[model samples]
Target chain A: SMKQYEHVKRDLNPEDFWEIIGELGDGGKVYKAQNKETSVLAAAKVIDTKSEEELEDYMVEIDILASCDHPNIVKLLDAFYYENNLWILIEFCAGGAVDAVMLELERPLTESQIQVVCKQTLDALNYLHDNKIIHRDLKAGNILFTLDGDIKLADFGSFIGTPYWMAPEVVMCETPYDYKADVWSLGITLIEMAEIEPPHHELNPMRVLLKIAKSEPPTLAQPSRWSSNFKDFLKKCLEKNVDARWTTSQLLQHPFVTVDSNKPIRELIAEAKA
Target chain B: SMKQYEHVKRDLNPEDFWEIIGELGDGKVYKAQNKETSVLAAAKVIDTKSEEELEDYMVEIDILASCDHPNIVKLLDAFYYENNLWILIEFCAGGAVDAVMLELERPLTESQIQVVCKQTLDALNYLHDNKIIHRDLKAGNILFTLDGDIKLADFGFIGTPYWMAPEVVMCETPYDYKADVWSLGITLIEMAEIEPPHHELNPMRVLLKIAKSEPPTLAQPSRWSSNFKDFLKKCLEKNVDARWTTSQLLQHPFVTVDSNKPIRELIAEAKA
Candidate 1:
């Protein structure tokens, strides 16, 4: 029974509850295991009432995501349903997120730190590309940092509805979108890291829609925040035309992301006396 | 005309008239001019009938002989009705035909004699096999000592000068050519160091009878000196089944020819 219960299985009875963990973004439900030692974070997402076939589709989605494993990806540990509420257990990141940390620090990361995070993000994106999946909803809240300062990308709630990050081609025509568009969303996450907020946030939905249609992509807040090499690297990631966006393999080769000569992050910190 | 005089025009009228020089073996021809050095030892041959046709045939035969460097050295030069007789010749012997006469006194050293005897027999056998008309090969004249030799024989007005023996392949049913069979065996006697074993025969009459008659049979080679007979046995074997091809004779050890070998180690030693 423990083995069977290890991962959330389908089928449900009403009236199960778990204590909420730190909230993930504004709208998503986040909960922690009652046994604190487990350190596992779980989220409950209510599925829009659908036909039995649609529920089966959700089961396949949960199964696929839960089974995936890659270092920089947030792993879905388990899934289940109880009381008509679907439950998902995923790896918890204690170091909060890139958006929160950058906002709190109120500054762009050292070139070394930006390079490390960019590399970790590229590695994760390349894995998704290899698996033929795209993380269409990549953004700051979705990317979690760890104590050692490595990043794991999370969040799949927005991944359910036709998320805005995906191209209209993917949503309207059901045409395939490769990982390059996912790379575009990852660039948005990097923008949040540098600016401490998503660009054009003050605009209303209609204005935002207009901006998406007509506005040039927002430029970096301080073009000189990181090394020139890093500016070029980020420029490639955020190409205004989505098709011109770099693939994970191409992005990883950018000098900012590729490790600099033998100097490690720790060595730089020691040299700065930090 | 340059070509008109291009014929076998030589100036030496032999001792015996009209003045002509002879060719010896395929390698050279004697051309007589006013130059005294052009003259070599001369002989006058019987004026056989069909003399012109016979001489033409001999020249073509020499062309064939040049390709086949077998044991018997071919005749190289000749003159017409010179000195009142036909002239047939071969290489100017720098040495003598004394080996045959002196065989008992100073027989050829094993290899020394073997080389001379074996080459002569091979040459005789080669000419006969190819159907050439060589009617005058005998002990004293199929000459050789060590380095070079010629199939000379007969001061008896021989060398036959007949039409070449036609090839067997060309012979038709109910036809026979015996000159080849008859003369080749006589050539074999010379190989064995015996006079052709034909004591009183005239060369022209002998060759005509051989050209027209059933093939001549000569004395068994075994009747000759045993050592010499061994060489003769190859030349005169009756069946013609025992004969050698020119290529086969060329490879026979008595030719003393060396096969070429690559000097691979010389390169390696130089490199070192």
Candidate 2:
């Protein structure tokens, strides 16, 4: 349930009816402050910064987010600068992150859950690639969700990532890794959904990073646990030779994607069990 | 250094030399007491009716060892029955395979070793795809000459268990030839870093260790030098799925060291 405010509390308006309910996040400039804004619980990413670079990047963030409009994508509601920091208020999604719920699911998710997530993710990717923009980094943390469990992808920070799901070429970046790199990440997300464990043996963060740099791409490798078809799709996504990978549009046509899940987005979730 | 024995010795005589050399491998059998008199050294697999099952395995070994490619292993000599089961092999004067080419003769820079390893994998994969098992694969078992030549040795005979297939552990009903693939993978692991792939294998318990556990150790990248360790990375694929086959390994720069040679040399040289 979201909280709504009774009276208007614009910066110029009377009293402070909006109380800080939680910390949404802190992205340099403004701390993400969650507050009740007139019948709507809103979270505003606020940054107080005089630096030109910070302001410039923050603006880019807003433009990118605002231009992106999909049911699966979060909307940038409004923006303003108060004090030294900049503010970008976004629609408050209540369900939290897909990774958060997926992690807590009692068992491995059904093919239905995987399909909806993948379809939504691929559609979002299709949108970005069509615009000739690339999200070089993709991971569970970057994907947000609705209260009903649908998901949206986010984040464009200094292009960092949780590399466990990163593709081989991305980690050993021959050229600056691009959008195809996100497909590699989707393979990792698929891995997370299918297996409770991260790919490969567990290691410290640095060691895992080192392994990523020195390892062969296993996204398509015939895993003892994963479906052969899924592994084949991952193989294409994580090909060590990036040129060999499928483009965003090509992936939507992949057999792994085109295979029937037999339901709409909401119904898919309705029939889905962990 | 392997000694070339002069006059062939018979039962009592070879058995006398057994302690001086090494145990007549428990795997073989002496067919006839006088069969040890053959001039060429032979690994004789014995079939005491009591141990007839061992004979069936030895025959399987002989068929597998017969798989031939220039860089691949060759069967030297085998005597199905001899005094204490004699199997003779081509002597590799160069102690461990690492001594094949002098360290100074490396065709690849530290960064390019992956290419070499990739080629080695290609050769192994050829055998794997064909179902011929080179059960014992190790830097020591991979013999080479001064000209940077390598051959998979002791094809189906590996007393060391460290490289056994994973299915061997579970006592799976049917055998998995992929285990030998794993062994070949370790061979590449050893060559890339010029250290034993798994130094943890105690000299005395090598067989038992591989049989009971997974590969001895994951490769340490900080200690390696290659194209950012890509070649060794693929070779040390912990999962058989991640590992390369002969065709795939051949595509790597590390295994195709011959490519790095002078252009004139490549034109003249055939097998790398």
Best by lDDT: 2
| TM-score (chain B) of candidate 1 | 0.43
**For candidate 2, what is the DockQ-based docking class?**
incorrect
Chain B TM-scores across candidates: 0.43, 0.54
- The reply for model 2, stretches above 4 Å from the true place, is A1-19, A23-38, A106-108, A156-162, A219-225, A259-274, B1-272
In candidate 2, position A208 carries an lDDT of 71
> What lDDT tens digits, residue by residue, belong to model 1 across residues B74-181?
333444444223344443352234444343433233333444445554564554443344444444454542234344343332233322232332332311223333
Residue B118's lDDT within candidate 1 is 51
A53-160: candidate 2 lDDT, tens digit per residue:
877666655655654557766666556654454556667766555555555554545555666677777888777675445665566656666656677776624756
Per-residue CA lDDT of candidate 1, range A1-274, in tens?
A: 0001123554643123344544554535454443245544554444542476766666656544653468888776555566555666667676666666656556645656656777787888787675546666777767777645577877545233423343323433333345566776676666666666666666665565455556666567778656688677767876756567778888777767766432333343343334
Q: Residue A274's C-alpha lDDT in candidate 2?
A: 26
- What is the per-residue lDDT of model 2 for residues B11-94, given as tens digits with 9 covering 90 to 100? 334443321233322344222222444332224444435457645545554443434465654444443234334445543322
